[PDB]
Design a protein around this ligand. Structure first.
Ligand code: MG
Ligand code: ZN
Lengths: 736, 97, 71, 188, 58, 201, 362
């Protein structure tokens, strides 16, 4: 198309050939996937190309798209599920004809000579603006001046005939035999074709969501990158040189691609075929899509389909175990989890049975999307819940309609068993993480399931196991709470920056030499005000030169030992870290625990100011052993201010003291007669005197921040004081 | 000019293997000679000049055909230590010509 | 064609004696003093081992073949 | 790595390898010679080591024919080599030596013979197949002896995989015959 | 491990313990906890009100 | 034990079994220490004090003091101290750099007090030689390093001209002569010995 | 212990003074590891029981599929195990499947269910995986011990250094670099990319950059800051090179790298072939090799490496040498002329660096 681009359109017997060849290539992929009909094959697989897809077919065929296929579906916070609705290009339009290139190249090289001839008299440095403007123009392009080789390339004179003679030197046929593109700087640009190809799909939201990505469901696209296909596709398969046997294997490299597309490719729309179920699993597999079966066997490996079903049921039970009173449930019963209930698809039994002593009215049968119900249609009290798991395909991730249809079928099918007529069915699509409920609701139930189910989805670690196995099979990796701290739970902050520390002093060389020093681990609970402070003198620093990596392990090991020894009743529910690389050594030690969760704080924390607490640490440095010291950071503050203000105050005062620390020596004594008493950590100031220094410190933080920000007042006073009270890293206007 | 002509020669030879990637012995001997020719570059020119003056009789050429279904093409693999001399000479002849 | 020394109540192979010179031993007799143990080889050979040496590379310090047996 | 001068053991392993496998297996022959492998074995045999390679002095008519043909051909030396059958290297070094012989003849005879053309300037040589055959030294030991030992074994082997393996199955069936016979003898 | 030193500065006077064993074995609370509880009720309701009004206009 | 010359605090000075000269003394640590980089500061400080003390003793004799340390295939910290003529002191730099180039490594030149601790961390084998002017010669290339390289350089013809003494085992003197040299060393060092009056505490 | 060396030594020391009662007094003083995709280093774990949990029934892959374990062990598994451990389950099942005659009606992964092998193969693979874990550990520890960049290194070249911060240091290159003032910023302790630096060391690396721009701006130069981080799969130590250029080159440099990065690898590699840099710690995932280049304080360009054979390890030095018309020896060789060359260079820059108060306020 680059060489022939003027001629090819008139050559239309060649256009018939190009349609034939493009169709042949597609047929070869269809055969490799094993198929004998178009119907399971939407175009989208090929054209989705590098960015998402992994293939990347450029087209010259008038492939009329299925576009009635182009519908994508999303779940709202209400549990209601919303639907969204929308010819792929020939290159020929994008590839500029040679007439255009020859006229455009004459004028662009002419105007460069004028601009350079101007620039030679003007001796002024040549503009960046024109060089960014003219980039794709000239037969020797203008970017050829950028080429970096060009000081040598000036001496390469044979090169166009020489590239033709390479056909005698080298056994591989070269399509670009005519263009040494470092001289020809590059006579085409695909980027408009790729971007329009996404538009012709409606790609970015629509096609991503469509395939497997809803199974990964984590955020949008922007974080996500594809790793190398590490696994059996590469390392031994290359090493052994078996190639007679590798011809027998030859589907296996397709495995990464086939898994991602398989929600499309598996889809039941064969024109002709029959449906088979993968054992111990609810997946229906249509034809022998070659690699997919082992890929799914490796994802599901062990019972996990059953294990997901029982875990969400018992998490539902645990909600009802708490919501006994507000629902008038005298007990919640867990029915027998028959070991095939979760993947027998013809029938179901209730899983959770609720008991009551109440007079009660219940809705006719209704969806989570119905925000109010005919809740007086009937009076009854006995309730069942039933949970159905699903693995959707692009023809059907229907879960609103599937929840409706399966509820009606199983309640009416005599093969089913149910304890009462008043029931909800819960449906979850493991291929898409969509959920739906269809139910005879009593009034309280619908908002509870709505709230619980959303929180359940993330929490329910059996889904985490499934997702992480999908991510690993995909090799696809991503680059990436303020009310919770007060709210109720046992939550800790932890530090590692003060643990391993080194001091610098100059040798008689006049260059700098290092000496290492004792360091502290800072652990803090914001709701109780309680601080634990573990000192590391001897044990780590004597032992190794690894000490930084060992110090991370020892930080996680010492905090693990603290949690393990001190309670079983009041072990932290959450631990919060800014150092988030610190999450990973904690996580392995939490594997002894399971019951504890770690979060990455998303907000900046005092711990650099704890280096100023290291001044009080110097009183610790006087101690000779790796002792532990216990503190509460709240004095008289502990009663009155402690929940609401004192976290905000301590965050503000502690962060402020770091950039202020000499100035804080003055400000801590707002009047010279004021004092800090030995039984307190903070100055003896009342309410209003604490407010005066608090407001001064807050404004002084904003004043120093204002010195960069100096356009500060109008936006940053309203928005950024909130965000600085949170502690966001606010650097946004250039980053936006 | 010679040091710059040698760069153009060596980078032409290396370009074929950057595409081809798989190296038996002879591609390993050639890439060793090309990488050597960079750190040698004044020495490598001295060999190339000495080769062009003295040697006059050469190691055997291998021949292979390239299968385009309407017509074969004949492909020759000259010995690597000579190819750098031929490759410098090709660049030099065309530059002076 | 190996001699394996195993511990009481323990199923795993604590010590493995393995050499090509090891062979099927149909009869083994231990001295009552525990000083020596005798082994008969099917190719009309007798080889002596020390019960405490465990020199797992195997050895033939003293061997005899004067018997006219046929295994 | 490949190349450099040819020892004795490499020529003699080359001859011996040429005896069992040789006249065009040479990739297989290189398996016995490290460091001299595919192309260099063939080039050593045909240029230097072939019988009939006529390593003797250049007579009158051979020198006549070589100068006659150098005037007739220009530089065609691979074609010239069959006619004089003294091959390509032998022609070229003789021809260049005869060109030296004329200019040197009076004035060079003592000094120009000696003060330039006496040796290469320490440089590495592309010829070494054609020039020599070094003796193996008085204490040749472990480089030569390793390949000498590999050569002797590979010259002896004479058997396929199946014959070597089924010979063990004959031995192992004989061993099972002894064990199973004796159990029959004693349990009967 | 039982001999690992703890110092306690949480009370008005310092104490030293054989920390891990002893600390593992180791009216006004309701008045304190209730005023924090009620104010958190107020603030959470207040933030819900602000966010709901913005969402309502959206 | 008869070969010990002087015995300060962290370190003691002793004559080797095979001395290059009559004034060759070595300073070793009484605790089992691999090198000066592993040695505490007080051990290294006394080594620098011995260097100063022996230089003053050498200065009375009209000699310069040369020191070097070899941390390679050793388990006990040993510092060698050899006294040479002032003329040979200038030759040291050319002798060391020539011997290093012949051995196949580079000596790096450091100023009046730099290399000993600062260039490398504990556990690294290293050789260091300090010249009488205070500059240090240091190298990290210890693979195949000659164990007697420091003795070999000092024993060369322009310095001491005692190439036979390079191998310490051959030059070993009789026990009666060894006691004489140690007693002579003790007497000459005794006026300069500043440690003899630190004992009051 | 070492104080015993003083008193053991002081015995003769009193006798050198010859006060026999001092002799008595000093005598009476004595004579009375694994990697993860995030690029952490974490404690190892071993599959000691996983050979025995399987049901001893059907063919191999069915046993692995049926074996049963609770969500506890599955959460532990999924947090410890890399994707390699999941994908390696292909091997023994399908390697033997390659020999078997296939029909399009029932085939590739069907035959993979049918293959047998049992405990002798599991023991050999179990021992293999254990040996590979030890090899991984030894490889990791070698990457710490052969690291010349850590201040704890045995291979350190400390005379390179011109300034040291709390967590980072600034030094002259070890070679005939592109300029006498060719400098590097290095983290004092080991990490394999700047993205893997957490907030204090990340921000401290940026802090040097304001000083260096100001120092070279006083010369009317511009400067290029770039990271080559091929290291990330293997754990070598990152540094940012700080190369000064003439202002006329600085104005062009963003053009040169913008072009070259679009050409560094084949056209059909998977990810985006160029990243514009704004929030780099969130734009490129941890554990990916990448290149990034910044021009003065302006955030520049990055690329995520996918073919370490194709993307050249010298990339930016070739480009900047191509802006400076230098001969290839200035970037191909890394000719390590050091002894006097670095000392004069380090001291000369140090004399130029000292006005930057960040050097002194610490
Ligand atoms: Mg076969
Ligand atoms: Zn490092």
């Amino acid at each position: 198309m680059t060489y022939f681009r003027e001629a090819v359109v008139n050559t239309q017997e060649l256009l018939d050939l190009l349609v034939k060849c493009e169709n042949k290539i597609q047929t070869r992929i269809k055969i490799g996937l094993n198929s004998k009909m178009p119907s399971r094959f939407p175009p989208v697989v090929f054209y989705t190309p590098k960015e998402i897809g992994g293939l990347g077919m450029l087209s010259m065929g008038h492939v009329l798209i299925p576009q009635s296929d182009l519908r994508w579906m999303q779940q709202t916070e209400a549990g209601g599920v919303t639907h969204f609705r929308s010819l792929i290009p020939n290159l020929y339009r994008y590839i500029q004809p040679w007439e255009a290139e020859f006229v455009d190249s004459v004028r662009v090289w002419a105007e460069y000579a004028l601009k350079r001839q101007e620039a030679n008299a003007q001796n002024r440095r040549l503009t960046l603006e024109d060089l960014d403007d003219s980039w794709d123009r000239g037969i020797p392009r203008i970017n050829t001046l950028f080429q970096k080789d060009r000081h040598t390339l000036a001496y390469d004179k044979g090169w166009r005939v020489r590239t033709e003679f390479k056909a005698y030197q080298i056994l591989k046929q070269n399509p670009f035999w005519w263009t040494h593109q470092r001289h020809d700087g590059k006579l085409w640009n695909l980027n408009n074709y790729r971007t329009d190809m996404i538009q012709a799909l409606g790609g970015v939201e629509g096609i991503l969501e469509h395939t497997l990505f809803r199974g990964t469901y984590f955020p949008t696209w922007e974080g996500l990158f594809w790793e190398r296909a590490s696994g059996f596709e590469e390392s031994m398969k290359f090493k052994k040189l078996t190639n007679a046997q590798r011809s027998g294997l030859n589907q296996i490299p397709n495995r990464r691609f086939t898994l991602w597309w398989s929600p499309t490719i598996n889809r039941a729309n064969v024109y002709v075929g029959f449906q088979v179920q993968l054992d111990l699993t609810g997946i229906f597999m249509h034809g022998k899509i070659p690699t997919l079966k082992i890929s799914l066997i490796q994802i599901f490996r062990a019972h996990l389909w059953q294990k997901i079903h029982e875990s969400v049921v018992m998490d539902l039970c645990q909600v009802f175990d708490q919501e006994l009173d507000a629902l008038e449930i005298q007990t919640v019963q867990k029915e027998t989890i028959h070991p095939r209930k979760s993947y027998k698809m013809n029938s179901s039994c209730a899983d959770v049975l609720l008991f009551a002593q109440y007079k009660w009215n219940v809705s006719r049968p209704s969806l989570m999307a119905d925000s109010k119900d005919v809740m007086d249609n009937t009076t009854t009290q006995k309730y069942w819940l039933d949970v159905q798991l699903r693995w959707g395909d692009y023809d059907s991730h229907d879960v609103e309609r599937y929840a409706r249809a399966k509820f009606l079928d199983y309640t009416t099918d005599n093969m089913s068993i149910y304890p009462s007529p008043t029931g909800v069915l819960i449906a979850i699509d493991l291929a898409y993480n969509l959920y739906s409920a269809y139910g005879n609701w009593f009034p309280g139930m619908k908002p509870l399931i709505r709230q619980a189910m959303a929180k359940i989805i993330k929490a329910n670690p059996a889904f985490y196991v499934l997702r992480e196995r999908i991510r690993k099979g995909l090799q696809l990796y991503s680059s990436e709470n303020y009310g919770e701290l007060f709210s109720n739970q046992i939550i800790w902050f932890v530090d590692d920056t003060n643990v391993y520390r080194v001091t610098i002093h100059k040798t008689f060389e006049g260059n700098l030499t290092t000496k290492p020093i004792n360091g502290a681990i800072f652990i803090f609970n914001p709701r109780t005000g309680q601080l634990f402070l573990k000192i590391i003198h001897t044990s780590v620093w004597a032992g190794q030169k690894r000490l930084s990596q060992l110090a991370k392990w020892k930080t996680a090991e010492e905090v693990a030992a603290l949690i393990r020894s001190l309670p079983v009743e009041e072990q932290p529910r959450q631990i919060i870290v800014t150092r988030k690389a610190m999450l990973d050594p904690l996580e392995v030690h939490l594997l002894d625990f399971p019951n504890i969760v770690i979060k990455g704080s998303e907000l900046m924390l005092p711990f650099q100011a704890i280096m100023k607490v290291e001044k009080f640490g110097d009183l610790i440095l006087k101690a000779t052993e790796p002792q532990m010291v216990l503190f509460n950071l709240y004095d008289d503050w502990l009663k009155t201010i402690s929940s609401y203000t004192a976290f905000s105050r301590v965050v503000l005062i502690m962060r402020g003291m770091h950039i202020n620390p000499d100035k804080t020596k003055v400000i801590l004594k707002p009047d010279k007669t004021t004092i800090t008493e030995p039984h307190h950590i903070w100055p003896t100031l009342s309410d209003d005197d604490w407010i005066k220094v608090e407001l001064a410190l807050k404004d002084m933080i904003l004043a120093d921040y204002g010195k960069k920000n100096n356009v500060n007042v109008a936006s940053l006073t309203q928005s950024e004081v909130r965000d600085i009270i949170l502690g966001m890293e606010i650097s946004a206007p250039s980053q936006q | 000019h010679d040091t710059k002509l040698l760069i153009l020669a060596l980078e032409r030879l290396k370009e074929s293997y950057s595409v081809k990637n798989r190296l038996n012995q002879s591609q390993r001997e050639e890439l060793a000679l090309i990488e050597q020719a960079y750190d040698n570059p004044h020495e490598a020119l001295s060999r190339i000049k000495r080769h062009m003056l003295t040697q006059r009789a050469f190691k055997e050429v291998g021949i292979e055909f390239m299968d385009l279904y309407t017509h074969l093409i004949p492909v020759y693999d000259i010995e690597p230590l000579e190819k750098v001399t031929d490759a410098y000479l090709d660049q030099y002849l065309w530059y002076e010509a | 064609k190996s001699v394996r020394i195993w511990e009481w109540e323990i199923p795993v192979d604590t010590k493995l004696i393995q050499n090509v010179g090891l062979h099927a031993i149909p009869t083994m007799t231990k001295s009552p003093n525990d000083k020596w143990v005798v082994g008969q080889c099917m190719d009309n050979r007798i080889v002596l081992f020390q019960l405490v040496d465990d020199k797992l590379r195997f050895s033939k310090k003293k061997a005899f073949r004067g018997h006219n047996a046929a295994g | 790595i490949k190349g450099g001068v040819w020892k004795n053991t490499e020529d003699e392993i080359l001859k011996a390898a040429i005896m069992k496998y040789g006249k065009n297996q040479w990739s297989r022959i290189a398996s016995l010679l490290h460091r001299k492998s595919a192309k260099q074995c063939k080039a050593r045999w045909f240029e230097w080591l072939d019988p009939g390679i006529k390593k003797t002095e250049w007579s009158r008519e051979e020198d006549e024919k070589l100068l006659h043909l150098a005037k007739l051909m220009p530089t065609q030396w691979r074609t010239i080599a069959p006619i004089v059958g003294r091959t390509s290297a032998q022609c070229l070094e003789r021809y260049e030596h005869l060109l030296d012989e004329a200019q040197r003849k009076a004035e060079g005879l003592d000094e120009e013979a000696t003060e330039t053309r006496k040796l290469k300037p320490g440089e590495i040589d592309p010829t070494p197949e054609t020039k020599p055959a070094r003796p193996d030294p008085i204490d040749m030991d472990d480089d030569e002896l390793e390949m000498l030992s590999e050569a002797r074994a590979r010259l002896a082997n004479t058997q396929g995989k199946k014959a070597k393996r089924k010979a063990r199955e004959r031995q192992l069936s004989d061993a099972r015959r002894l064990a199973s016979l004796q159990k029959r003898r004693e349990m009967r | 491990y039982s001999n690992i030193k703890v110092i306690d500065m949480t009370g008005k006077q310092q104490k030293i313990y054989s920390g891990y064993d002893s600390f593992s074995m180791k009216l006004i609370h309701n008045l304190n906890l209730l005023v924090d509880l009620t104010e958190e009720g107020i603030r959470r309701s207040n933030q819900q009100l602000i966010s709901l009004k913005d969402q309502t206009t959206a | 034990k008869h070969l010990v010359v002087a015995i300060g605090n962290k370190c003691y000075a002793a004559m080797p079994k095979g001395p290059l000269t009559e004034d060759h003394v070595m300073v070793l640590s009484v605790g089992h220490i691999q090198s000066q980089v592993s040695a505490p500061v007080e051990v290294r400080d006394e080594i620098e004090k011995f260097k100063s003390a022996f230089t003053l003793m050498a200065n009375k004799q009209g000699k310069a003091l040369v020191t070097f340390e070899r941390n390679f295939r050793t388990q006990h910290l040993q510092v060698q101290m050899v006294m040479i003529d002032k003329s040979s002191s200038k030759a040291l730099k050319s002798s060391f750099t020539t011997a290093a180039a012949c051995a196949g490594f580079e000596l790096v030149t450091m100023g009046p007090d730099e290399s000993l601790l600062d260039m490398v961390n504990e556990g690294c084998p290293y050789f260091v030689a300090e010249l009488p002017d205070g500059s240090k010669l240091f190298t990290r290339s210890m693979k195949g390093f000659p164990l007697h390289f420091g003795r070999e350089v000092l024993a060369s013809t322009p310095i001491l001209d005692c190439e036979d003494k390079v191998d310490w085992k051959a030059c070993v003197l009789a026990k009666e002569k060894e006691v004489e040299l140690v007693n002579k060393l003790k007497s000459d060092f005794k006026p300069f010995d500043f440690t003899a009056e630190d004992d009051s505490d | 212990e070492d104080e015993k060396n003083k008193l053991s030594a002081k015995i003769l020391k009193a006798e050198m003074k010859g006060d026999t009662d001092l002799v008595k007094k000093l005598k009476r003083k004595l004579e009375s590891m694994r990697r993860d995709r995030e690029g952490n280093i974490l404690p190892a774990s071993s599959r000691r029981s996983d050979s025995d949990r399987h049901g001893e029934g059907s063919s191999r892959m069915r046993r692995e599929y049926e074996k049963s374990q609770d969500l506890d062990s599955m959460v532990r598994e999924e947090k410890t195990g890399t994707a390699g451990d999941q994908l390696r389950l292909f091997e023994r099942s399908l390697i033997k499947s390659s020999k078997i005659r296939r029909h399009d009606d029932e085939s590739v992964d069907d035959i993979a269910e049918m293959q047998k092998g049992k405990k002798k193969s599991d023991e050999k693979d179990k021992k293999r995986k254990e040996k590979e874990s030890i090899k991984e550990h030894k490889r990791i520890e070698r990457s710490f011990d052969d690291c010349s960049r850590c201040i704890d290194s045995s291979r350190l070249k400390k005379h390179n250094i011109i300034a040291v911060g709390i967590n980072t240091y600034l030094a002259v290159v070890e070679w005939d670099g592109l300029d006498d003032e060719h400098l590097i910023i290095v983290p004092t302790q080991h990490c394999s990319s700047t993205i893997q630096l957490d907030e204090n060391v990340w921000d401290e690396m940026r802090l040097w950059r304001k000083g260096l721009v100001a120092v070279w701006k006083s010369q009317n130069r511009d400067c290029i800051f770039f990271e080559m981080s091929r290291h990330v799969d293997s754990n070598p130590h990152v540094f940012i090179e700080c190369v000064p250029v003439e202002q006329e080159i600085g104005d062009m440099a963003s053009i040169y790298f913008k072009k070259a990065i679009n050409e560094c690898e084949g056209e059909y590699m998977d990810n985006k072939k160029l990243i514009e840099t704004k929030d780099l710690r969130r734009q490129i995932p941890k554990g990916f090799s990448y290149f990034a280049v910044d021009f003065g304080l302006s955030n520049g360009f990055a690329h995520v490496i996918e073919s370490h054979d194709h993307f050249p390890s010298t990339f930016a030095t070739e480009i900047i040498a191509g802006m400076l018309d230098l001969p290839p020896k200035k970037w191909r060789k890394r000719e390590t002329d050091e002894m006097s060359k670095q000392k004069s260079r380090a001291e000369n820059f140090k004399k130029l660096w000292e006005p930057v108060d960040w050097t002194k306020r610490l």
